[PDB]
Design an enzyme around this catalytic site. Sequence first.
Site: not given
Ligand SMILES: [Ca+2]
Ligand SMILES: [Ca+2]
Ligand SMILES: [Ca+2]
Length: 637
Positions: A6, A96, A145, A187, A189, A267, A283, A356, A396, A471
């Site tokens: 066993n 065993d 901020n 605000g 940063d 993207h 452009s 991402d 991600e 998020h």
């Molecule tokens: Ca700021």
């Molecule tokens: Ca045993």
């Molecule tokens: Ca343009």
Amino acid sequence: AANDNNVEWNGLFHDQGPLFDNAPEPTSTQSVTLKLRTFKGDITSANIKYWDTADNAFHWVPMVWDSNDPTGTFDYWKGTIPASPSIKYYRFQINDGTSTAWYNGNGPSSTEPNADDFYIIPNFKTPDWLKNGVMYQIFPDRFYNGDSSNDVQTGSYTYNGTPTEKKAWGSSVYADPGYDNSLVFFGGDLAGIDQKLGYIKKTLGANILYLNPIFKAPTNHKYDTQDYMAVDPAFGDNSTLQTLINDIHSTANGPKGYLILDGVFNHTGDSHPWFDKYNNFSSQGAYESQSSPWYNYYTFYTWPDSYASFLGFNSLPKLNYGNSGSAVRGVIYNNSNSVAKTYLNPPYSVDGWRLDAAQYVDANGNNGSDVTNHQIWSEFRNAVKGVNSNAAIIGEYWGNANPWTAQGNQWDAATNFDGFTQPVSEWITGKDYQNNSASISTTQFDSWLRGTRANYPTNVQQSMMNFLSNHDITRFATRSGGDLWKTYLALIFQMTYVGTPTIYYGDEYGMQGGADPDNRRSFDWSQATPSNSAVALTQKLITIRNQYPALRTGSFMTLITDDTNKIYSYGRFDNVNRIAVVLNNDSVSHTVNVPVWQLSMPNGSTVTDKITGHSYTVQNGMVTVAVDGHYGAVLAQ
Ligand SMILES: [Ca+2]
Ligand SMILES: [Ca+2]
Ligand SMILES: [Ca+2]
């Protein structure tokens, strides 16, 4: 135990921690010696059975008795798998007499398993600082901020016809009539993050910072990139970033720090010059002309209004990676001046990238999760590691990320939604991370965890980004119905489990919040002090994790799964320390007899519950400790 036909499952154990594997991250020339634990004199023979990808066949390595543990309760058998460049997978056959049992990543089995084998991936290395650190995730606009001069004001500018809206610090995140939730600014940063590094690196003790997108983009989340090569003006400029990096890397303001940026490469935003849907640049972008120099960077079904995008969102046109050597692969990662290399090379030298929507990256507008997607991430790894072998790559993915980790040629780890966030949520709050009813028992929790760890190689497990919230999901404190103790329990598990503890800014003090954008509330600094029990506990837990390597790279062994009293106990251990974590998920206190003998804690030795500071003595292989409801003990020695 004895030779009695066993095999006693309770005495068996193996994982790739220090006591059982001498080479968890071997090179092509390092052999791997493995040790299997059993009760003393319990078996007659044991064999290592490993699949070798070098020849697509199984190989057999008979084991031999090696030693006893200090308590003389167990035997350790040993066997060695030869050194070679090939990936290998292994399991154990334990006998065993007439009794046979098998054992692999999923634990013991009466029948031979066909999945969940342990991994051996030569030359595959994940950054050790990631395995040993604690991460703090910051959504830039909502943390602090530090410079009001760059704040986006109400009406500062418009995007797709909608004006921006500025909210007072601490107010609701929802946009008012005439505005949009994605154009709401508080605000926050880079200067702010820089000025609050003391809180992060000292008050809490985290040494890794992970930031949501910081490059030029019209939204508040900025996943709709307009310029990868420039820090968004609202957050500062590239010099501000350089200063923040220097202060993070500094060892004069706390532990050496690391910075991981959010790389949005599947993207771009529809306002990026390569696309230029609103003609914000002289452009000609792909949306503007089929003669655009960047026309082939995207995929049009019906030019110009029908094109490949992220989940059908026209604001996020999908990049066409083409074949190897393409211009797109060049500007994203191959070129020295690419997005990936620019920030990894001086004068920035960041420490990693969070990928991402990584599963979607592809050529021709395809959906990813295919050969091309994996080829791209393999080239990405070569590009990144070529510049800095210690730069982390975390992709991600919300499910089993084995396809991008198990071959050691792509990511170092992934966002652990499936192996951490979800199970923790359902066990403690009875809700899934979307806040819908979904509860699991302790035995189910333990099984869920084991199965998900088994999806990954050990170094990957130790490098997973384990967050309680983030998020894109509801706040843990909301799912818990505001019960602070549920957060206490979650933090204790988080800081003692396998994988990088990752704190979503605010979770350390119990910040609440529903689905996006409500999960991105502004940070209240008056609640960010040791006066808040969760904050005080978080600091204590980080200090505890940093004190014991066993908690970061040690073995993991389940000790108790009591569905009656809702008690979950597991041990984290290595050559030096032995730690028994005892968690009480019930609403009432419970006195628990912890079987520390399983971790080989000697009788007469002492342990200290690092959560309360109280000391205990090991008696008859046990440690009796009373644990409050929705709380835990960390018995270490
Ligand atoms: Ca700021
Ligand atoms: Ca045993
Ligand atoms: Ca343009």
